[PDB]
Amino acid sequence: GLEKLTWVSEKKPDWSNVQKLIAACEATNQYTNIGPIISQLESFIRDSFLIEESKAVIVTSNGTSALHALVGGINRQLGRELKFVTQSFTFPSSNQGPLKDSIIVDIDEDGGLDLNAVKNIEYDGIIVTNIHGNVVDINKYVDFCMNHNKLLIFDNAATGYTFYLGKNSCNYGHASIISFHHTAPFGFGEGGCIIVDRLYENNIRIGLNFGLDNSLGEKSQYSNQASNYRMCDLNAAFILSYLQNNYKKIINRHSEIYEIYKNNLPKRFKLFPNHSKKNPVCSSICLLFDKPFRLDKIPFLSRKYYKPLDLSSPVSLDFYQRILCIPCNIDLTDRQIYEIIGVLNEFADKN
Amino acid sequence: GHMGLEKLTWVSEKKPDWSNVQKLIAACEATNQYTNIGPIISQLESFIRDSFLIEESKAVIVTSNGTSALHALVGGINRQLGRELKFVTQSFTFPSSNQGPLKDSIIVDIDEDGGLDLNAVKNIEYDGIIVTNIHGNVVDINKYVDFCMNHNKLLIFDNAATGYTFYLGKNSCNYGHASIISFHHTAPFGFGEGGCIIVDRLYENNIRIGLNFGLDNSLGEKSQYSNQASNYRMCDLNAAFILSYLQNNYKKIINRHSEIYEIYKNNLPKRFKLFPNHSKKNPVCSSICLLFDKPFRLDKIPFLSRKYYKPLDLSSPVSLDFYQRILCIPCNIDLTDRQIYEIIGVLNEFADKN
Ligand SMILES: Cc1ncc(COP(=O)(O)O)c(/C=N/[C@H]2[C@H](O)[C@@H](O)[C@@H](OP(=O)(O)OP(=O)(O)OC[C@H]3O[C@@H](n4ccc(=O)[nH]c4=O)[C@H](O)[C@@H]3O)O[C@@H]2C)c1O
Ligand SMILES: Cc1ncc(COP(=O)(O)O)c(/C=N/[C@H]2[C@H](O)[C@@H](O)[C@@H](OP(=O)(O)OP(=O)(O)OC[C@H]3O[C@@H](n4ccc(=O)[nH]c4=O)[C@H](O)[C@@H]3O)O[C@@H]2C)c1O
Ligand SMILES: [Cl-]
Ligand SMILES: [Cl-]
Ligand SMILES: [Cl-]
Ligand SMILES: [Cl-]
Ligand code: NA
């Protein structure tokens, strides 16, 4: 039964629908530099993911370029290269591009950047990762950054539809980013999205286009903080089509998969720390064993994320050593989930 | 009075060969591998090598866009050498070469041949230079090669707009340590977004793993991200649209762009010159770049036309002079010879009155 597990659901273009969308590009020859699909996808994300009016929805080439475009747009707006802190327990994106010199601190046992490690250092802002659809105690980060006059970015690459105190977690902090990578529940190919305070929208949007704004004619000015960060309308069509056809099923079924693990926890495993009242929509089901173990002991498709960016961060390393990332996708059967739980019970008994 | 020119577009009308694109992407549907180097990437990199004639000494590495080809190239070389390398770029170019890992590159003027003024780096500390082959025109490539050899400097050609201009019998992309090309929709060979790195094999591995955050899955637990890396890879969906467009069009684009250049070469309007170019055969141009003898405004030209490049440093005098004197005329496979002569008619009329 577990032989046919896949990391990602089988995804295939709805060709008739993708062709209908890109017909708009064919009619004007505008397939990028903000063609006719970008507004359609940004709208659909706003309305389907429930983003608030005080937030821009800005699609980009990938989750990484969503984070980098966000920072570059903010840097240009403030006339300074801002210094960010990120947690060790995250993907490389938050220590690359305009963040290549970001400060790396440990997480606390609740899965997010340890606020204790930024008490006595110089920084403009923090990046907190909501791990694989799970969310931190978001209001403790909002409150701290408010009291210290710091920018707050949520790395929601893997966290497009987990609700915190009645709204999409993407609506908290000054900004968040989402990934539409093929491996994300909502993704298809490559893509990213910035959810950000309107204060920064214009500088971020022109910052996808080297800083250039055609509407300014002769005073259009590049920024050395910008790049080519835009989403191509081809990619926007594939992602919008996948979302139109699947987004509601993904939300419901991922929540149901979470329910089975929550009510049938395997022996000596705990759910990854989460602070949502309703079940999170996960990119994988993250469990923590009570002690370090190797993946090669687990006899079905599984992974460990995230190898600490700084291998010296103790909680990050402990989590990495104890974590199991189980496939979570709309192809999973309840039968496969109960078989996985039975295998992990057996794993615990032998280990 | 020129409704015959009302239909001019900057770019040829491009539409997917849906059957060809669907055939290519069926490889992705079979395995669910649409990115992270799916089954189309090797096919597009092979097609570019065989079609553009890239030597076996060079890796062909596709990327998300021409800007990411340049940035992934520099980020991979930075990782291999163990430091953030200092590049000089020319003011008369696109922003890409003063962004990302090049955000602090040194900017210098061009000489009147359209490339980086080598006399301007006399007393600078730098590791390499980036020279822009403007809109398919090439610089005296061997001048730059000899200089970078004598001075032990890395040489990158920004060929964003220059995928098939030959210098001494080989594609200009084959010269220096590396070049990059753009498959942006606005590029003759482009469709949507895309880029390509042509680079000495010495750097191939660091650049390829640098598309994937510096991670190498073949190292297992020793796989290690680099702060010099990013997400720079080309999505196989994009590879399929670009490959299909190249397969159907690249030979016609080379021949037709050469034919269009030939008409301008033999019917130059009064007081305009061809942008400087050092190839023996006609270049393959993203636009026909003419220099008027005097500064002028685009709003005097009664047909679709542009100016490139606004100088990155507006205190670069040769760069500003070119900008003020340049006219970038549409060059694509939809243009009729009849339209080109109506354009030259308009530009003689412009010249006599300015
Ligand atoms: C020397 C050099 N180096 C690097 C790069 C970076 O490559 P990449 O990252 O691929 O853009 C470039 C890129 N040059 C290109 C760039 O790709 C494109 O956006 C464009 O810039 P820009 O003129 O600012 O873009 P635009 O105003 O939106 O479009 C130019 C014309 O192109 C038309 N166009 C534009 C997009 C489209 O989908 N279809 C289309 O027909 C558009 O209607 C307009 O008529 O031209 C540049 C010369 C370069 O020239
Ligand atoms: C916290 C955080 N922040 C930022 C980003 C950056 O977003 P983006 O720039 O979109 O990747 C991310 C991205 N995380 C993702 C990333 O997008 C993806 O490449 C992947 O990384 P990695 O595990 O190194 O890649 P992989 O080894 O190629 O693929 C993981 C699995 O996914 C399967 N896969 C992969 C690609 C595909 O097309 N189809 C497919 O089935 C693949 O077969 C394998 O089983 O997972 C990360 C968790 C993040 O987790
Ligand atoms: Cl809640
Ligand atoms: Cl679908
Ligand atoms: Cl030659
Ligand atoms: Cl075609
Ligand atoms: Na054809």
Rounded-to-integer distance, Cα A93 and Cα A99, Å: 8
Beta bridge mates, A56: A196
Domain spans in chain B, listed from the N-terminal domain onward: 18-244, 250-352
* Residue of A65, A130, A153, A181 to test ligand 2 pocket, by largest number of atoms within 8 Å of CB: A181
Least Cα distance to B252 among B135, B333, B161 occurs for B333
Query: What is the torsion angle, in degrees rounded to the nearest 10, for the CA atoms of residue A183, residue A184, residue A186 and residue A189?
Result: -40
HSE on the CB side for A193, CA within 13 Å? 31
Cβ atoms A328, A257 nearer than 8 A: yes
Strands (DSSP E) contained in A39-94 are: 55-60, 84-87
Beta bridge mates, B158: B132, B180
Burial A134-167 (b: 16+ CB within 10 A, else e): bbbbbeebbebbeeeebbbbbbbbbbbbbbbeee
Number of C-beta neighbours around residue A248 at 10 A: 11
Classify residue A53 by its DSSP letter. T
Ligand 1 lined by B5 (C-beta under 6 Å): no
Cβ atoms A304, A295 nearer than 8 A: yes
Architecture of domain A15-240: 3-Layer(aba) Sandwich (3.40)
Please compute Rg for chain B using Cα positions.
Answer: 21
* Residues whose CB falls within 8 Å of the CB of residue B202, separated by 6 or more in sequence, listed in order: B80
Cβ atoms A270, A109 nearer than 8 A: no
Cβ <8 Å between B68 and A228: yes
Which tokens sit at B143? Answer: 């001048």
Peptide bond before residue B323 is cis, with ω within 30 degrees of 0: no
Rounded-to-integer distance, Cα A191 and Cα B67, Å: 17
Rounded-to-integer distance, Cα A343 and Cα A340, Å: 5
State the best of A25, A182, A188, A307 to mutate against chain B, taking most chain B CBs within 10 Å: A182
Amino acid (one-letter) located at A327 = P
Cβ <8 Å between B64 and A61: yes
**Which helix (DSSP H) or strand (DSSP E) does residue A177 occupy?**
strand A175-179
User: Sheet containing A269-271: which strands, arranged edge to edge?
Assistant: A269-271, A284-289, A323-327
For chain B, the distance separating the N- and C-terminal CA atoms, rounded to the nearest angstrom, is 20
Rounded-to-integer distance, Cα B59 and Cα B61, Å: 6
In the block, tokens 């577990």 appear at A2
* Residue of A91, A170, A316, A320 to test ligand 2 pocket, by largest number of atoms within 8 Å of CB: A91
What's the CA-to-centroid distance between A20 and ligand 2, angstroms?
29
Q: What is the DSSP annotation of B152-205?
A: T-EEEEE-TT-SS-EETTEEGGGSSSEEEEE--TTSTT--SS-EEEEEEGGGHH
In the block, tokens 């996985």 appear at A340
Provide, as residue numbers in chain A, all residues whose Cβ is less than 8 Å from the Cβ of B235.
189-190, 235
Provide, as residue numbers in chain A, all residues whose Cβ is less than 8 Å from the Cβ of B225.
92, 95-96, 309
- Supply the residue whose CA is at minimum distance from atom 42 of ligand 1: B10
Rounded-to-integer distance, Cα A65 and Cα B67, Å: 13
Distances (CA, A) of A179 to A98, A190, B337: 18, 8, 47
B18-244 fold: Aspartate Aminotransferase; domain 2 (3.40.640)
State the best of A5, A25, A26, A190 to mutate against chain B, taking most chain B CBs within 10 Å: A190
User: Sheet containing B154-158: which strands, arranged edge to edge?
Assistant: B58-63, B195-200, B178-182, B154-158, B128-132, B87-90, B106-108
- The residue count for chain B: 354
How many angstroms away from the CA of A166 is the closest CA of chain B? 33
Least Cα distance to A164 among A276, A320, A239 occurs for A276
User: Sheet containing A103-105: which strands, arranged edge to edge?
Assistant: A55-60, A192-197, A175-179, A151-155, A125-129, A84-87, A103-105
Give the A:B interface size as CB pairs under 8 Å: 133
Ligand 1 lined by A214 (C-beta under 6 Å): yes
Q: What is the DSSP annotation of B238-302?
A: HHHHHHHHHHHHHHHHHHHHHHHHHHHHHSPPTTEEEPP---SSPP--SEEEEEESS---GGG-S
Least Cα distance to A224 among B109, B57, B116, B89 occurs for B89
Q: Give the three-state DSSP class for A81.
A: coil
Resolution of the experimental structure, in angstroms: 1.9
Least Cα distance to B170 among B87, B55, B305, B5 occurs for B55
Number of continuous H segments (helices) and E segments (strands) in chain A: 8, 12
From the CA of A210, give the closest atom in ligand 1.
Answer: 24
- A8 alpha carbon, distance to own chain's centre: 15
Q: Which residue pairs, CB below 8 angstroms and at least 24 apart, start in B145-153?
A: B145/B175, B145/B176, B147/B118, B148/B176, B153/B126, B153/B127, B153/B128, B153/B129
Which tokens sit at A271? Answer: 């759910």
- Supply the residue whose CA is at minimum distance from atom 20 of ligand 2: A183
Residue B156 φ then ψ, to 5°: -115, 130
Number of C-beta neighbours around residue A80 at 10 A: 11
Cβ atoms B263, B337 nearer than 8 A: yes
Least Cα distance to B130 among B312, B278, B287 occurs for B312
* Angle, helix B18-31 to helix A15-28, in steps of 10 degrees: 140
Cβ atoms B14, B314 nearer than 8 A: no
Ligand 2 lined by A91 (C-beta under 6 Å): yes
Least Cα distance to B89 among B319, B306, B307 occurs for B319
**Which helix (DSSP H) or strand (DSSP E) does residue A176 occupy?**
strand A175-179
Provide, as residue numbers in chain A, all residues whose Cβ is less than 8 Å from the Cβ of B228.
96, 100
**Which helix (DSSP H) or strand (DSSP E) does residue A145 occupy?**
helix A138-148
Provide, as residue numbers in chain B, all residues whose Cβ is less than 8 Å from the Cβ of A211.
95
* Residues whose CB falls within 8 Å of the CB of residue B273, separated by 6 or more in sequence, listed in order: B290, B291, B293
Q: Pick from A91, A96, A230: which is nearest to B227 by CB?
A: A96
Least Cα distance to B63 among B105, B24, B35, B21 occurs for B35
- The residue count for chain A: 351
Cβ atoms A31, B186 nearer than 8 A: no
* Angle, helix A233-263 to helix A38-49, in steps of 10 degrees: 20
Which tokens sit at B55? Answer: 């030597």
Cβ atoms B47, B243 nearer than 8 A: yes
Which tokens sit at B265? Answer: 């070469």
Rounded-to-integer distance, Cα B103 and Cα B95, Å: 9
Cβ <8 Å between A97 and B230: yes
Cβ <8 Å between B231 and A93: yes
Beta bridge mates, A154: A128, A176
Rounded-to-integer distance, Cα A306 and Cα B50, Å: 40
Distances (CA, A) of B324 to A123, B231, B307, B321: 43, 37, 8, 5
Classify residue A112 by its DSSP letter. S
Amino acid (one-letter) located at A166 = G
User: Are β-strands A55-60 and A192-197 bridged in parallel, bridged antiparallel, or unpaired?
Assistant: antiparallel
**Which helix (DSSP H) or strand (DSSP E) does residue A173 occupy?**
none
User: Are β-strands A125-129 and B128-132 bridged in parallel, bridged antiparallel, or unpaired?
Assistant: unpaired
Q: What is the DSSP annotation of B87-154?
A: EEEESSS-GGGGSGGGTTPEEE-B-TTSSB-GGGGTT---SEEEEE-GGG----HHHHHHHHHHHT-E
Which tokens sit at B64? Answer: 């998300």
A248-350 fold: Aspartate Aminotransferase, domain 1 (3.90.1150)
Work out the angle at residue A189's Cα, subtended by the Cα atoms of residues A184 and A195, and round it to the nearest 5 degrees: 55
Cβ atoms B127, B87 nearer than 8 A: yes
Cβ atoms B205, B67 nearer than 8 A: no
In the block, tokens 């999409």 appear at A168
Cβ atoms B159, B19 nearer than 8 A: no
Cβ <8 Å between B237 and A233: no
User: Are β-strands A125-129 and A151-155 bridged in parallel, bridged antiparallel, or unpaired?
Assistant: parallel
Ligand number with the minimum distance to the CA of A247? 4
What's the CA-to-centroid distance between A106 and ligand 6, angstroms?
51
Cβ <8 Å between A181 and B35: yes
In the block, tokens 């793993």 appear at B209
Residues with CB under 5 A from ligand 7 (ion): B 248
Rounded-to-integer distance, Cα B21 and Cα B243, Å: 8
Classify residue A232 by its DSSP letter. P
HSE on the CB side for A142, CA within 13 Å? 14
In the block, tokens 């059967």 appear at A333
Work out the angle at residue B238's Cα, subtended by the Cα atoms of residues B198 and A11, and round it to the nearest 5 degrees: 135
Ligand 2 lined by B35 (C-beta under 6 Å): yes
Rounded-to-integer distance, Cα A192 and Cα A185, Å: 13
Q: Give the three-state DSSP class for A321.
A: helix
Architecture of domain B250-352: Alpha-Beta Complex (3.90)
Ligand 2 lined by A95 (C-beta under 6 Å): no
Peptide bond before residue A222 is cis, with ω within 30 degrees of 0: no
Rounded-to-integer distance, Cα B159 and Cα B182, Å: 8
Classify residue A3 by its DSSP letter. G
- A58 alpha carbon, distance to own chain's centre: 14
Cβ <8 Å between B99 and A238: no
Question: Diameter of chain A by CA atoms?
Answer: 71
Q: Pick from A63, A100, A235: which is nearest to B227 by CB?
A: A100
How many angstroms away from the CA of A184 is the closest CA of chain B? 12
- Supply the residue whose CA is at minimum distance from atom 31 of ligand 2: A7
Q: How was this structure determined?
A: X-ray
Query: What is the torsion angle, in degrees rounded to the nearest 10, for the CA atoms of residue A215, residue A220, residue A223 and residue A226?
Result: 30
